[PDB]
Amino acid sequence: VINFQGGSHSYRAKYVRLSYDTKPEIILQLLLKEWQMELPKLVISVHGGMQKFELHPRIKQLLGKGLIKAAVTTGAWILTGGVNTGVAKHVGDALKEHASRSSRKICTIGIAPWGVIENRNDLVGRDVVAPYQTLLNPLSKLNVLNNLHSHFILVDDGTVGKYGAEVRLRRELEKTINQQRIH
Amino acid sequence: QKSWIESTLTKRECVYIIPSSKDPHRCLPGCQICQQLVRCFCGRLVKQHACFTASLAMKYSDVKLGEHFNQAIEEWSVEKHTEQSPTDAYGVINFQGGSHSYRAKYVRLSYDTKPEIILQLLLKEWQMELPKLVISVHGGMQKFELHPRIKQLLGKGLIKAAVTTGAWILTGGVNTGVAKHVGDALKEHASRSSRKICTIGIAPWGVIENRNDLVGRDVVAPYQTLLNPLSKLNVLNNLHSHFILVDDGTVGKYGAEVRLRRELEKTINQQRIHARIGQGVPVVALIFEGGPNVILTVLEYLQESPPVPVVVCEGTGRAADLLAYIHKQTEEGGNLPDAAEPDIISTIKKTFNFGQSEAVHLFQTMMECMKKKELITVFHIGSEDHQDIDVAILTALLKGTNASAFDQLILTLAWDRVDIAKNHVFVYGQQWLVGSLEQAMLDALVMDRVSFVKLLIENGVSMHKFLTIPRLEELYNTKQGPTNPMLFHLIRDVKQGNLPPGYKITLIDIGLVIEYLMGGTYRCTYTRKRFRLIYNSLETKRFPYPLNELLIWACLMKRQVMARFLWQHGEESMAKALVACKIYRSMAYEAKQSDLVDDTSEELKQYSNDFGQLAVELLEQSFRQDETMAMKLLTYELKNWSNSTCLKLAVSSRLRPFVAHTCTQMLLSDMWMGRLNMRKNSWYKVILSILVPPAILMLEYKTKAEMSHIPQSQLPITRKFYAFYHAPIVKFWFNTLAYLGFLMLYTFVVLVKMEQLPSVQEWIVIAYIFTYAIEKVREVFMSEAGKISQKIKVWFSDYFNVSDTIAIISFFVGFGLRFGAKWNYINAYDNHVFVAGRLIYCLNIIFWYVRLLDFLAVNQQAGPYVMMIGKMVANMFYIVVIMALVLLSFGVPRKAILYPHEEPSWSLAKDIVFHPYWMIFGEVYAYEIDVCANDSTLPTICGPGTWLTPFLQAVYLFVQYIIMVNLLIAFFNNVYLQVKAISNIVWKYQRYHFIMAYHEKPVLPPPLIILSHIVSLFCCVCKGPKLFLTEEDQKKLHDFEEQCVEMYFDEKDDKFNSGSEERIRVTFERVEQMSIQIKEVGDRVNYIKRSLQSLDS
Amino acid sequence: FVAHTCTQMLLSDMWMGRLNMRKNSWYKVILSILVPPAILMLEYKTKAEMSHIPQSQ
Ligand SMILES: CCCCCCCC/C=C/CCCCCCCC(=O)O[C@@H](COC(=O)CCCCCCCCCCCCCCC)COP(=O)([O-])OCC[N+](C)(C)C
Ligand SMILES: CCCCCCCC/C=C/CCCCCCCC(=O)O[C@@H](COC(=O)CCCCCCCCCCCCCCC)COP(=O)([O-])OCC[N+](C)(C)C
Ligand SMILES: CCCCCCCC/C=C/CCCCCCCC(=O)O[C@@H](COC(=O)CCCCCCCCCCCCCCC)COP(=O)([O-])OCC[N+](C)(C)C
Ligand SMILES: CCCCCCCC/C=C/CCCCCCCC(=O)O[C@@H](COC(=O)CCCCCCCCCCCCCCC)COP(=O)([O-])OCC[N+](C)(C)C
Ligand SMILES: CCCCCCCC/C=C\CCCCCCCC(=O)O[C@@H](COC(=O)CCCCCCCCCCCCCCC)COP(=O)([O-])OCC[N+](C)(C)C
Ligand SMILES: CCCCCCCC/C=C\CCCCCCCC(=O)O[C@@H](COC(=O)CCCCCCCCCCCCCCC)COP(=O)([O-])OCC[N+](C)(C)C
Ligand SMILES: CCCCCCCC/C=C\CCCCCCCC(=O)O[C@@H](COC(=O)CCCCCCCCCCCCCCC)COP(=O)([O-])OCC[N+](C)(C)C
Ligand SMILES: CCCCCCCC/C=C\CCCCCCCC(=O)O[C@@H](COC(=O)CCCCCCCCCCCCCCC)COP(=O)([O-])OCC[N+](C)(C)C
Ligand SMILES: CCCCCCCC/C=C\CCCCCCCC(=O)O[C@@H](COC(=O)CCCCCCCCCCCCCCC)COP(=O)([O-])OCC[N+](C)(C)C
Ligand SMILES: CCCCCCCC/C=C\CCCCCCCC(=O)O[C@@H](COC(=O)CCCCCCCCCCCCCCC)COP(=O)([O-])OCC[N+](C)(C)C
Ligand SMILES: C[C@@H]1CC[C@@]2(OC1)O[C@H]1C[C@H]3[C@@H]4CC=C5C[C@@H](OCCC(CO)CO)CC[C@]5(C)[C@H]4CC[C@]3(C)[C@H]1[C@@H]2C
Ligand SMILES: Oc1ccc2c3c1O[C@H]1c4oc5ccccc5c4C[C@@]4(O)[C@@H](C2)N(CC2CC2)CC[C@]314
Ligand SMILES: Oc1ccc2c3c1O[C@H]1c4oc5ccccc5c4C[C@@]4(O)[C@@H](C2)N(CC2CC2)CC[C@]314
């Protein structure tokens, strides 16, 4: 469980390091059995630019009102990269504003590659509550996990400093959920 | 003398009368104008000197030579030619005419007063508090303008800085300068509103308008505050609180104050800001429209050691705006890299008429001021930096003074400002040496600064590694926050003796206090041999659950806001609430049982009920979320809490709403029924099946699928019998039927004639009580694990166990006499050892009838009535004492009047109580009242004075039968109404006690229980609702609990925010803002229409 | 006004005088009236304590 020390009650988020070749059913077992997540009624997969970008103030509070409602009125799993260098940073803005859940949980998983995560070391440990600095330079683009997500599946390909290990496991998860009975 | 102001301070006077700076004056009257318009350097005309010698300078000639050489004209000073003397002007100004006619202390003292004497005056004499900040406001000393927006935008912020910190603001005082506008900040925003600001104004005495009025020993001098609003005259601003009017022995010259003000700044910055905090009181300068000299005063700070930050405002286009201009021009290092000097030299002269020369030299000052642009700060109102000048003045102490991260943090702590610490201290760039955040945590805990403790945990402080045995003892032994006086007395009670005077509290002694307060068989960790063999020695000197230990700390120290905060953090949240309730409950009882009359017990009782209600509300959250996990919370063994359960802790506190909660009752029902599963009519199905064992097979039994969860849990023919007889409902009725049979026999024994040898009935009766006694001995020793002394105290805390103990002991005294009596006589009542034994039986049987009330209290309707009766009898003592005095007040005179020939006898005792007692119940003894009447049954008693006793009895019955009996009835009626109001709650709490009682009992009742005894203790030699979780499910349950704590606060916040009061107030505050925003439209709409009229042409 | 804690604290200091028992004072006083040496086993206020007592004479 991450302890995002410094972020607004120091939020918590489960995490794990697993290979790109994990069978899609094992993933589904992790999300639902181990993490006790509910099978959702929707999956929103948020793609976007993987490089620090600007967003006008009106549209900011006009997006974070709506994506939240869709995931709060339905129990939807939002999916991101997790790292703040991309769109995940602004999914967090939607969560910070509007008091994301307010006793009404959103599950936003961030599937990131392990070989890029800033402070890879801290997370190492058997079932450890690893704390995590969430106040690095606000401009410097560094692959730093967004402190407002709830879950992280950090995809390992045995490497450092290359993305692209996550592209399948994310899509495979989408197939795996879309083959589950909604009720 | 006994007057420190007068004895210590000093007033100068100019003893010496050189002419007015040169030759006296022309004007043919000559020697005559020397009286009219010829002054001294002193500043005073001849008659204003008024000194004892200067008046000898009014008669014949002055104190000098014949023609007075010119190196004596220069020789005048305020050091050699002024005589020091005790002061005259001091007291309290009465600013008559100003808005309640404000008050402000004042004093006239010399420029050479030692800086410590000043500090003594401010703090000792004037009883001022040593501040946590000093704002020194410099500015233009000449009447100036200030735009309306910036007016109410400055006075909101400088006030907050001095109100959120207890800062001394410093000014000149006189309205000719910046002090006038400091007053505007004070007038608007209701400066203090019960939250004092101390704004001293250090002015020179020789310029004060109406100098005279203030003259006087400790005088309340009034002071006109309504002179011409334009005319610039040195008139003290009526909104300041204190004035130190600096004397140099002169009139009409400033500049005597420049040192004493700065010397005061040094003197305060060398004072500890707080007991633990080892810094100096910070100082900062503020600049509002400064004149020429204000520029140098800036530099005068920037050099000195330690430096002083300087927050320069904007507006008005002088030294304030000017420094703001160049501060944007010079580079980061501090030298204008471009070639733009003549353009800014041009700007200097537009504000300061010099022309070229002083303009550059004025510029030469600033380029040095632009070297140290880290100790300078510009608060520009347009683009709104810093969001506030409050934070700006405060933040200036944080940046530029090269202060450690620790020193930055701890100063915010002294101020009690997290908003500044969060945003400006906790940020990328700080380095945080090894143990600085931890030492900060200790200061925040000790100082009861909850908001920082929150911040420190968020921003990287582990309480696991922080909290050690030494640091925890430092927390119990401190006096720098809210304390509990009781705790020292509780330690003195559990340490039977007294203590050396500087005794520092030990954790073992805390452990002994906690055991006292928790009671029963609670045993704290601190008293255990492991912790002792560690503690005596002092990874091992840390604690696994620090937030448990600090919750105990905060509650024993009566630090409730801190205790509520530490509760919501960490694991074991429901247990901590229940422990806190018990601790405060027991302290409340100790306060109530003390000889002190105060509000401590009601305060501590309230705190107990606060945590008690948290535990109930948490249980309801959990129950609505998951019933099975809610029931597990009630039952999991609390390793950290003497291996108890949350249900047992709640029962220890008489916390009935928790025990009466549905979750607890569902748990108790499953225990009571066991593997039986009848939903209706269970009482007679059980009875008929005890009496007809084959009917056991016709009953409904739970499947193992059902008897699988049962979060307190520990079909062929044979297992149905086992299931039946081991069910607590069955053990109840089986014990109840045997008890009733016991009483019926023992009733027979005492009513029927007793022979030599016991009848078979009497033997059965003896066997019951003997084996019932063995059972009670075993219930004590196989009770909750603890010290035998604790086990004993607990069991003798129930009424029926005390009664059964007396009942058992008295029976065998009675049996011994009945059985071991030798019969010298055939009659058997001639032998008085035998009779004594029989009479004990006849009295002992009362105990056994009254013990049926306990069986009957198992019913939902009867049970509360039984509790009523107990509460009636327990609390009626003092009414009955009064009834007894009324009884004797009648009995004694009646006997004395009617029987005047008696010798001493114990019959006198009987006679004075006997008939008066039966009168309580309406027996008037009608034919005994008037003993001299014809129908009297006591005719021999007729005698002198016997006519008095009917009057006495008339009064007695009125008071006793009518007043006193009905007072007792009125008391009983209140008991009825109190218990009836909570009747269902009462029985549900009783239900815990009897379900637990019969769960632990054996399957045979007390005649045949001996087999259950004789068979059980073989199986131990030869070979209750507590869930023992593994560490993995233990962690899931904690995760469940923390989720429900979060849901508790969310619903609490939502309920609060939906309330009408919260909606009226947010509306109130929000409508206020809009009224400015519309005036901000109503203002700007002009700028449109008038600008359109400009483009109309 | 009379029932206010300040008044009651004042009255308690008068009632106890220089005695300083917080618990169980009634029988400690009785047994010490009847057994005068038990007077020495009792707790007494220091002069530091018997110094403020804003009604003390
Ligand atoms: C010898 C015969 C007379 C005595 C009667 C003995 C028999 C038994 C009856 C006893 C009734 C008295 C009980 C109170 C006294 C005990 C201690 C006590 O509580 O003291 C109190 C004052 O006490 C008084 O004010 C008592 C004054 C004497 C009354 C004498 C006549 C009573 C009997 C009338 C004649 C008819 C009945 C008797 C038949 C003749 C002070 O108590 P505390 O501890 O400071 O306060 C406790 C609360 N706290 C924890 C918050 C502090
Ligand atoms: C919600 C409510 C639910 C229902 C509740 C129902 C409760 C159920 C309870 C039920 C049991 C009630 C029975 C007890 C009273 C019996 C007394 C009696 O009648 O004695 C008579 C009967 O003869 C005997 O008693 C002789 C036997 C001697 C031993 C007693 C055992 C009795 C059975 C009990 C077994 C142990 C049970 C207890 C174990 C601890 C003897 O008297 P007599 O003959 O007239 O005397 C001769 C006189 N002569 C000398 C002049 C000639
Ligand atoms: C936590 C537990 C709670 C409950 C409490 C548990 C403990 C309860 C404890 C109970 C015991 C209480 C004390 C009783 C003392 C008897 C006094 C007496 O009468 O003496 C007399 C008989 O003395 C004898 O010794 C002969 C009688 C036989 C012994 C019967 C009593 C002992 C059994 C007890 C079984 C207890 C079972 C306990 C099982 C655990 C002496 O005088 P006498 O001989 O009559 O004089 C004759 C004179 N003449 C010849 C001139 C006429
Ligand atoms: C409340 C105001 C009153 C004064 C207060 C002082 C207390 C006064 C205490 C007095 C008792 C002390 C003196 C004993 C003298 C007895 C002699 C006697 O004749 O006894 C008689 C009764 O009595 C007995 O047989 C024994 C005593 C029992 C009654 C006393 C119990 C104590 C009161 C309980 C409360 C505690 C008391 C403490 C204070 C509340 C026997 O004779 P009889 O019954 O007439 O006849 C029998 C058959 N015969 C004719 C063949 C014989
Ligand atoms: C056969 C003829 C000869 C004999 C004739 C004898 C004459 C008659 C003699 C006696 C009558 C019997 C009753 C005695 C007093 C009751 C105590 C009491 O008030 O308890 C109550 C409070 O107080 C306590 O619990 C502690 C007070 C008692 C001290 C412990 C006993 C010590 C030994 C003995 C010294 C004590 C005095 C007795 C000594 C004589 C308990 O209340 P509760 O029930 O816990 O209420 C809550 C229940 N709940 C937890 C389930 C929610
Ligand atoms: C905690 C335990 C304490 C008690 C333990 C046991 C202690 C031991 C107890 C008693 C032993 C008594 C043995 C005999 C004593 C010598 C006198 C004698 O022999 O004869 C006399 C006995 O006179 C009596 O009064 C006997 C009864 C006394 C008991 C009084 C009640 C106490 C128990 C209450 C319950 C308390 C329990 C409370 C529960 C907490 C007279 O009888 P006689 O000589 O045959 O006749 C001569 C007269 N004649 C010529 C006319 C025929
Ligand atoms: C032979 C004659 C027939 C037999 C009689 C009939 C049988 C007797 C009947 C009833 C007996 C009592 C029933 C008990 C019910 C349970 C109570 C319980 O659990 O604890 C209770 C104690 O309860 C007691 O203290 C019980 C009474 C003491 C014995 C006195 C009996 C009456 C005699 C004297 C009268 C005679 C006076 C005049 C004399 C001339 C606790 O209640 P509490 O402490 O109030 O609670 C406060 C709660 N608080 C913490 C919030 C403050
Ligand atoms: C503050 C006020 C102070 C009081 C001032 C008033 C003073 C009193 C005024 C009036 C009372 C009436 C006079 C007394 C009776 C006269 C008869 C007589 O002398 O003999 C009587 C006795 O012998 C006496 O001497 C009785 C004296 C009474 C004492 C004082 C009573 C005070 C009353 C309390 C004041 C409460 C006031 C009301 C309050 C509501 C009767 O004798 P006998 O019965 O004939 O003899 C039997 C013969 N045989 C043996 C053969 C059978
Ligand atoms: C009063 C009226 C009855 C008269 C009948 C004749 C007398 C018969 C009475 C008693 C003797 C027979 C009992 C068995 C021996 C004791 C064993 C025991 O305690 O438990 C054993 C198992 O438990 C069982 O096997 C259940 C025994 C209780 C039910 C017996 C019903 C008979 C009485 C009513 C119905 C009869 C119908 C007639 C009634 C209307 C083992 O012990 P435990 O409890 O599991 O655990 C304890 C610790 N240990 C495991 C280490 C040991
Ligand atoms: C009833 C039972 C006792 C019988 C015992 C034998 C008889 C002894 C009894 C009385 C005679 C002795 C008393 C001293 C003389 C009077 C002086 C006085 O009043 O105060 C003096 C100082 O104060 C004292 O000296 C303290 C006196 C109180 C203590 C005496 C306790 C003895 C009785 C209980 C213990 C004994 C154990 C036995 C009891 C269990 C001065 O006066 P004041 O008060 O300061 O102020 C008044 C104004 N003045 C200052 C201007 C003067
Ligand atoms: C506050 C209350 C004030 C009232 C009161 O309680 C307290 O004050 C008590 C004083 C008691 C008397 C003291 C002395 C004796 C002598 C004794 O004589 C031996 C017997 C004899 C037999 O023949 C020897 O041979 C008999 C008893 C008697 C008169 C007492 C009776 C009860 C009295 C009146 C009590 C009364 C109820
Ligand atoms: O009020 C209750 C409401 C519902 C339930 C209970 C209550 O109380 C219990 C109780 O009491 C009884 C008394 C007599 C006969 C049967 C029972 C029972 C039954 C029961 O066992 C049962 C359901 N579940 C287990 C089942 C797995 C869910 C646990 C709790 C339980
Ligand atoms: O309720 C009170 C709460 C706290 C205090 C008191 C109260 O009442 C007083 C009272 O009563 C007692 C009765 C029996 C034993 C001791 C005392 C006392 C003690 C005491 O003296 C005491 C503290 N301070 C002086 C001390 C300087 C603070 C004054 C007031 C005082």
CSV table of N, CA and C in Angstrom, one decimal, chain B residues 632 634-639 641-645 648 667 671 710-714 784-785 996 999 1024-1029:
chain,number,residue,atom,x,y,z
B,632,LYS,N,-17.4,-9.8,14.5
B,632,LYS,CA,-16.0,-10.1,14.7
B,632,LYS,C,-15.3,-9.0,15.5
B,634,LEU,N,-16.6,-7.2,17.8
B,634,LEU,CA,-17.0,-7.3,19.2
B,634,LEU,C,-16.2,-8.4,19.9
B,635,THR,N,-15.7,-9.3,19.2
B,635,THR,CA,-15.2,-10.6,19.8
B,635,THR,C,-13.7,-10.9,19.6
B,636,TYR,N,-13.0,-10.2,18.8
B,636,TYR,CA,-11.6,-10.5,18.6
B,636,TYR,C,-10.8,-10.2,19.9
B,637,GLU,N,-9.9,-11.1,20.3
B,637,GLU,CA,-9.1,-10.9,21.4
B,637,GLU,C,-8.2,-9.7,21.1
B,638,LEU,N,-8.1,-8.8,22.1
B,638,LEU,CA,-7.3,-7.6,22.1
B,638,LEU,C,-6.0,-7.8,22.8
B,639,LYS,N,-5.0,-8.3,22.1
B,639,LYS,CA,-3.7,-8.5,22.6
B,639,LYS,C,-3.1,-7.3,23.3
B,641,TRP,N,-4.8,-5.0,24.8
B,641,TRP,CA,-5.7,-4.5,25.8
B,641,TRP,C,-6.1,-5.6,26.8
B,642,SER,N,-5.1,-6.2,27.3
B,642,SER,CA,-5.2,-7.2,28.4
B,642,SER,C,-6.0,-8.5,27.9
B,643,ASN,N,-5.9,-8.8,26.6
B,643,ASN,CA,-6.5,-10.0,26.0
B,643,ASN,C,-8.0,-9.9,26.2
B,644,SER,N,-8.6,-8.8,26.2
B,644,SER,CA,-10.0,-8.6,26.3
B,644,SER,C,-10.7,-8.5,25.0
B,645,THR,N,-11.9,-8.2,25.0
B,645,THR,CA,-12.8,-7.9,23.8
B,645,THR,C,-13.4,-6.6,24.0
B,648,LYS,N,-16.5,-6.8,26.3
B,648,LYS,CA,-16.1,-6.8,27.7
B,648,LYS,C,-15.8,-5.4,28.2
B,667,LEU,N,-25.5,-11.7,18.5
B,667,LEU,CA,-24.4,-12.5,19.0
B,667,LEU,C,-24.8,-13.3,20.3
B,671,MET,N,-25.4,-17.6,21.2
B,671,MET,CA,-24.8,-18.3,22.4
B,671,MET,C,-25.9,-19.0,23.2
B,710,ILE,N,-20.7,-17.8,13.5
B,710,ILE,CA,-21.0,-17.5,14.9
B,710,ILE,C,-19.7,-16.9,15.5
B,711,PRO,N,-19.4,-15.6,15.2
B,711,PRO,CA,-18.1,-15.1,15.5
B,711,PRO,C,-17.6,-15.1,16.9
B,712,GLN,N,-18.3,-15.6,17.9
B,712,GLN,CA,-17.8,-16.0,19.2
B,712,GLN,C,-17.6,-17.4,19.4
B,713,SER,N,-18.1,-18.3,18.5
B,713,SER,CA,-18.0,-19.7,18.7
B,713,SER,C,-16.5,-20.2,18.9
B,714,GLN,N,-16.4,-21.2,19.7
B,714,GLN,CA,-15.1,-21.6,20.2
B,714,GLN,C,-14.6,-22.9,19.6
B,784,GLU,N,-12.3,-15.0,34.7
B,784,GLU,CA,-11.3,-14.2,33.8
B,784,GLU,C,-9.9,-14.2,34.4
B,785,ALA,N,-8.9,-14.5,33.6
B,785,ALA,CA,-7.6,-14.7,34.1
B,785,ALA,C,-7.0,-13.4,34.7
B,996,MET,N,-23.9,-15.0,29.5
B,996,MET,CA,-22.5,-15.3,29.9
B,996,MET,C,-22.4,-16.2,31.0
B,999,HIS,N,-23.5,-19.8,30.0
B,999,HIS,CA,-22.6,-20.3,29.0
B,999,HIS,C,-21.4,-21.0,29.7
B,1024,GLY,N,-15.3,-15.8,27.3
B,1024,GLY,CA,-16.0,-16.8,26.7
B,1024,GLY,C,-16.3,-16.6,25.2
B,1025,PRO,N,-16.9,-15.5,24.9
B,1025,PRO,CA,-17.0,-15.1,23.5
B,1025,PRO,C,-15.8,-14.3,23.0
B,1026,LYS,N,-14.8,-15.1,22.6
B,1026,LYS,CA,-13.5,-14.6,22.2
B,1026,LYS,C,-13.1,-15.3,20.9
B,1027,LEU,N,-12.8,-14.5,19.9
B,1027,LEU,CA,-12.4,-15.0,18.6
B,1027,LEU,C,-10.9,-14.8,18.5
B,1028,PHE,N,-10.2,-15.9,18.2
B,1028,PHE,CA,-8.8,-15.9,18.1
B,1028,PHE,C,-8.4,-15.9,16.6
B,1029,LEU,N,-8.1,-14.7,16.1
B,1029,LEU,CA,-7.8,-14.5,14.7
B,1029,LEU,C,-6.3,-14.7,14.4
